[PDB]
Design a protein that fits this description.
The complex is a heterodimer. Chain A has helices spanning 4-22, 33-58, 64-71, 78-93, 102-121. By secondary structure, chain A is an all-alpha fold. Chain A has one domain (1-132). Chain B has one helix at residues 2-21. Classes of the chains: A mainly alpha, B mainly alpha. Chain B: This is Bcl-2-modifying factor.
């Protein structure tokens, strides 16, 4: 259910999706701004490297949530979290609707429905700092 | 089904190689 962990996940993702779409800095509206900056830099790198492939995927018009849930079917790791967020942020801007939170909610549910204790054991977003 | 699995594999490739480099 929507407990402390849920909102730690959701509000990080939603503020990143807002920054990606508005190009306004959002690090000051999350609790863990150091991990936010890592997420932002990592997402930027993934998009810069893979945007053409993202375009081809997106052209199929398949529901983004069907894709996200398949990415996390077997295992989770920080690379998969980063890549899901980057892909969904990229998709959200080629198409404002992201303020409704649906994308961020879907990613959060996909992570926490199966990997809640993994995420807590990572000290929430702190675990992403292996990429700093 | 398959196409959404094929897409997921593409993103998992990106993710898992990203994880490997960094």
């Amino acid at each position: 259910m929507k407990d402390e962990t849920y909102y730690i996940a959701l509000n990080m993702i939603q503020n990143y999706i807002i920054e990606y779409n508005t190009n306004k800095p959002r690090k000051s509206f999350v609790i863990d701004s150091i991990s936010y900056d890592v997420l932002k830099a990592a997402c930027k790198s993934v998009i810069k490297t893979n945007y053409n492939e993202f375009d081809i995927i997106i052209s199929r018009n398949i529901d983004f949530n069907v894709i996200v849930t398949q990415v996390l079917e077997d295992k989770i790791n920080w690379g998969r979290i980063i890549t899901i967020i980057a892909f969904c942020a990229y998709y959200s801007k080629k198409v404002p609707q992201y303020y409704d939170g649906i994308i961020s909610e879907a990613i959060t549910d996909a992570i926490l429905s199966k990997y809640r204790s993994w995420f807590i054991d990572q000290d929430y977003w702190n675990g992403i700092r292996i990429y700093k | 089904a398959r196409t959404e699995v094929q897409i997921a594999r593409k993103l998992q490739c990106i993710a898992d190689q990203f994880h490997r480099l960094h």
